[PDB]
Write an enzyme that holds these catalytic residues in place. Sequence first.
Site, PDB file in Angstrom:
ATOM      1  N   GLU A  11       1.334 -11.468  -3.073  1.00 27.35           N
ATOM      2  CA  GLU A  11       1.307 -10.687  -4.278  1.00 27.35           C
ATOM      3  C   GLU A  11       0.058 -10.793  -5.134  1.00 27.35           C
ATOM      4  O   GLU A  11      -0.199  -9.895  -5.911  1.00 27.35           O
ATOM      5  CB  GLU A  11       2.498 -11.110  -5.151  1.00 27.35           C
ATOM      6  CG  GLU A  11       3.826 -10.921  -4.410  1.00 27.35           C
ATOM      7  CD  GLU A  11       4.284  -9.480  -4.376  1.00 27.35           C
ATOM      8  OE1 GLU A  11       5.214  -9.131  -3.720  1.00 27.35           O
ATOM      9  OE2 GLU A  11       3.561  -8.655  -5.074  1.00 27.35           O
ATOM     10  N   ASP A  20       1.412  -1.399  -9.073  1.00 22.79           N
ATOM     11  CA  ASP A  20       1.672  -1.943  -7.765  1.00 22.79           C
ATOM     12  C   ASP A  20       1.399  -0.928  -6.641  1.00 22.79           C
ATOM     13  O   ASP A  20       0.939   0.206  -6.868  1.00 22.79           O
ATOM     14  CB  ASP A  20       3.041  -2.635  -7.737  1.00 22.79           C
ATOM     15  CG  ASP A  20       4.235  -1.730  -7.560  1.00 22.79           C
ATOM     16  OD1 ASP A  20       5.337  -2.131  -7.351  1.00 22.79           O
ATOM     17  OD2 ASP A  20       3.999  -0.479  -7.564  1.00 22.79           O
TER      18      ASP A  20
END
EC number: 3.2.1.17
Length: 162
Positions: A11, A20
């Site tokens: 991540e 994202d």
Amino acid sequence: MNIFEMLRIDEGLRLKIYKDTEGYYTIGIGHLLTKSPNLNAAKSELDKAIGRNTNGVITKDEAEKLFNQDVDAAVRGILRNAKLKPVYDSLDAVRRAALINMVFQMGETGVAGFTNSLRMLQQKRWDEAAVNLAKSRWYNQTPNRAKRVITTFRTGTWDAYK
Ligand SMILES: [Cl-]
Ligand SMILES: [Cl-]
């Protein structure tokens, strides 16, 4: 290697609101803020999450705190889920990390939807599970991260992460 280091790799860490891979407002270590397109609905969720007026920026500690909650919530969601729990119970320590990673990324509901792969994992048919897991929007959309998790399930080692 452990689940925290593994997810930190997948991540990354960003201290300012960002979008994202799906286009959603996120901050820290993959902490989803909102699916809404409004930056203000994002800042609001952020401040609610941190307990202060952040103006869209947080510190490393704040990011780590969110990360700790999120990993904890992922495990607990698995343990409370009737479809997931038996899988997790059946797995070794490394493969357990692989399931937690999918849950953190896609939520419990999403993962629980991988019926066939789940059954293959429980039966320990590694190679077969790895092939079925790859037939998914998940793999098509984030192929590099998906290959890493899948190799982890296939091998039961952290090689893809080293
Ligand atoms: Cl929260
Ligand atoms: Cl990827």
